[PDB]
Amino acid sequence: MVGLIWAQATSGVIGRGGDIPWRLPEDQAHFREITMGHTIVMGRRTWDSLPAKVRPLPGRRNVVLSRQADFMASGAEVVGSLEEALTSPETWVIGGGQVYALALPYATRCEVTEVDIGLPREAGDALAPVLDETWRGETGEWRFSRSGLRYRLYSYHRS
Ligand SMILES: NC(=O)C1=CN([C@@H]2O[C@H](COP(=O)(O)OP(=O)(O)OC[C@H]3O[C@@H](n4cnc5c(N)ncnc54)[C@H](OP(=O)(O)O)[C@@H]3O)[C@@H](O)[C@H]2O)C=CC1
Ligand SMILES: Nc1nc2ncc(CNc3ccc(C(=O)N[C@@H](CCC(=O)O)C(=O)O)c(O)c3)nc2c(=O)[nH]1
């Protein structure tokens, strides 16, 4: 089972300027709950974007995709291909835009947070993959974050 997990603005934006363009602590706790105890796979940029305090993310086997054969990330397994990254039975792909797109065909679950923030797409943003009609989804109820932003959770699956 390969799953993808991400949070997006309604527009599809997931990243800008090498970071995530909003604050939503409740969603980050959700991320931890889903991923804890599993292998997680991410692109090198997403690894770079993790706060030092949680790089690597604790309690998870951190796998990082890079085309730099020499790249080393403390506490992570650097691999050069998606094939080498997807060897664990349950794997969560945690981004970013490039790696979500790469892994989408391999995935049978998506755990998606929609963030109700006005954030029109800009050139060079990182974007969420678009889920087509092969996916079946359940839509959760809107909640307000302590940050003031409304958000909701989707669970998608395809067999
Ligand atoms: N809101 C959310 O849920 C999330 C948001 N983000 C945001 O996403 C953005 C980063 O996404 P993005 O810029 O797309 O970069 P990624 O995180 O997807 O990392 C891309 C890097 O992965 C490596 N890579 C890509 N394709 C391959 C391949 N086929 N084989 C081997 N290595 C490969 C390269 O590393 P190298 O260059 O070292 O070769 C490439 O530069 C940031 O802004 C981050 O904050 C990230 C995760 C979740
Ligand atoms: N839905 C959803 N998916 C994501 N998938 C990938 C990334 C990449 N960026 C991340 C991922 C995790 C953290 C992080 O600090 N996580 C900690 C703290 C958890 C907590 O605060 O309770 C942990 O998991 O232990 C981060 O600072 C950036 N983000 C999200 C995201 O924000 N939302």
Class of the CATH-defined domain 1-159: alpha beta
Radius of gyration, CA atoms only, the chain: 15
Angle at 139 between CA 133 and CA 142, to 5 degrees: 140
**Are 62 and 40 in contact, with CB atoms under 8 Å apart?**
yes
| Cα–Cα nearest to 152, from 121, 116, 110, 118 | 116
Q: Are strands 143-144 and 136-139 parallel, antiparallel or unpaired?
A: unpaired
Structure obtained using: X-ray
Provide the residue ranges of all domains of the chain, joining segments of one domain with +: 1-159
Q: Within a 13 Å sphere around the CA of 67, how many CA atoms are in the beta-carbon half? A: 2
Query: Is residue 158 marked as binding?
Result: no
Query: Is residue 14 marked as binding?
Result: yes
| Cα–Cα nearest to 115, from 77, 153, 88 | 153
Distance 78 CA to ligand 2 centre (A): 19
* Ligand 1 pocket, CB under 6 A: 6-7, 14-15, 18-20, 42-46, 49, 65-68, 71, 80-81, 94-99, 102, 126
The residue assigned the tokens 């963030």 is 115
Q: Resolution in A, one decimal?
A: 1.4
